[PDB]
Amino acid sequence: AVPFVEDWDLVQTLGEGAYGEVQLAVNRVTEEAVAVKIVDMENIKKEICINKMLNHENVVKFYGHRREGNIQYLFLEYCSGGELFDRIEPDIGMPEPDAQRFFHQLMAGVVYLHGIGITHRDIKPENLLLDERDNLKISDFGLATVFRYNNRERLLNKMCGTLPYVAPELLKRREFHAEPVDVWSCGIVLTAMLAGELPWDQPSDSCQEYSDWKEKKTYLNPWKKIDSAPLALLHKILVENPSARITIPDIKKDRWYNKPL
């Protein structure tokens, strides 16, 4: 918007994606900050619709949108704590208590989304932002979709996620349940938080690092950097068969999950 840019300074780019970028906008008079996602016409049509459904403390707030020619402008909560990735020291991760707290907040967000029949489909640290009190905020619903209509689930079939975070059934099954896919990527996020590295390029047979995990070689990186209490949870999350994979209600029963640190 031309009138918007007259009163709001587009200060800097917060991030760049495939079909555009997110910018920090600051009102010159009030100094209010908002994030402006600019998309040259990710599924932007469904993104807006899904964003309109969301209302939760661990999801990036959606203020509104408008079209200006062929460009779509989405107005989002500015998360001034930045990205989760920037709390992860490469090859080291972060303190276990910090990882635990973020993971609880991630579960809170995912439980909310799943409760209203929405799957994010691209959970990774780049899409987990932080507010000014370091509260985790799930971000970017460009790949999200509805997997439950009222109380009626449907299987999904789309392989749109970032490969290191994708569940193995996406490489093996034509159709699959939404919830265990998101649970899997949450486990990859937890691994990154605790070890500062991703375990594999992809969870395929042909990927050696995935084979090593399947064969319980937890004396190798990244696993050897992870305490056995949180590793025990990862053992239940990063289960190949999505039908045998831990569900979020059972994650809430895990010893490490509930361990005071």
Ligand SMILES: Cc1cc2n[nH]c(=O)n2c2ccc(-c3cccc(O)c3)cc12
């Ligand atoms: C840093 C940041 C703050 C923010 N506040 N509100 C928002 O939508 N964002 C963001 C939205 C997106 C991204 C982004 C984008 C691409 C890659 C990547 O790694 C990060 C960062 C932010």
